[PDB]
Amino acid sequence: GHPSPPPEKKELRKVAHLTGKSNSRSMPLEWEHELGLALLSGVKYKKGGLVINETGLYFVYSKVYFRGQSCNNLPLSHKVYMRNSKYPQDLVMMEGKMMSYCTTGQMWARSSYLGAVFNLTSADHLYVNVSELSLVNFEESQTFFGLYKL
Template sequence: MQPPQGRAGFGCRGDEPGGQVRPVPLPPVQQNLNYCPHIFWVDGCAETGAPCAPAVPTAPFPPPVPDRSRKPRNKGRERGERGSAGFLVMFLLILVAFTGVGLSIFKIFHLEKEVDELREAASAEHIPPAAQKLTGDREENLRKEARRAAHVTGNPAQQGLPLEWEPSSGHAYTSGIQYEERGLRVSEPGLYFVYSRVLFRGTACDTQLLAHVVYKRNPASPGSLVLMEDRATNFCSGQRMWARSSYLGALFRLRRMDSLHVNVSKIALVNFEESKTFFGLFKL
């Protein structure tokens, strides 16, 4: 059996006796890196020395395939989301600012209230007794001045003119005003509102005159001065019962010691019930 032909190796000689393979030294490695030895099979031996074939160019990598699983986002939708987020942030900032302002105002109001309370306590502690007495007297005088008023009601026990009044019973009262000589006398000058109401009624109708007059007197001036007056005629018709109310009211500046009185044309026609006929004044 013959040995196999064409065994590859570094080199061989076919003419060696016995077909023994003898190594053949390769040429030294050149500095040219593109050089490489090629081995050819010739009659079972490898022949070297042929130049290297040109290098096969490497094919470039294909471009990356885009990921189609992610769809492009809508720019309008992105802008809307950004706008909504900005509006929300702005609203939160405004809300925080208003909350801070409200808390500041509440704190300031609370501090002002505490300061006022401290001032009142300090002023009450440092007011001397004499000043407290003067303050109390002044307040008492103010209360007395505020109470300068009178309201008198009809009195059936009439004994001529001017009309007589009830000064204390029922709805009647006097405060800072004196009832004397059938009239109301003022002790302090000032601006007063004066009023009077008289109810006339009868059982038969006639043509007589109904008169209702309020006048004043003063010891420093002779005679009397009419302040208000009401006169009526033809106030009824037929022969049946009738009634007529007369009301007078106005504002007057009165002097000290002025006294006010009421006159009527006929006492017999006056209804003296306290809710129907009355007279009064009060200081403003």
């Protein structure tokens, strides 16, 4: 019911830090958003997506820790994308790709980091995609997705 005065609106900071969730087969990725190192305040989480409720500038970031037991140079993409009524098709915001990154047969590991400033609108939905779910390690310190309002 009652609106929050801009002093009380501004005490509650708009922030998300979502951490890797190993027990999901989903794409886009699902995330931990309550316990451990995770944070969620003033932004909604649903089905792997961060759902913006206040229009404005935000810094958005994601790290993915890729690893495997036997290198075959399967290409590794990592993206942050958005869906809203203007881009019901998805808009890629940030993306990186690894090809020709390990020696064949060897145990391997490599991370990808994405971060940038975006102007987001209320009801924008933000997600993380990767090319090979099985080649992601989901420890909270290794694989993560977040943002904050500027």
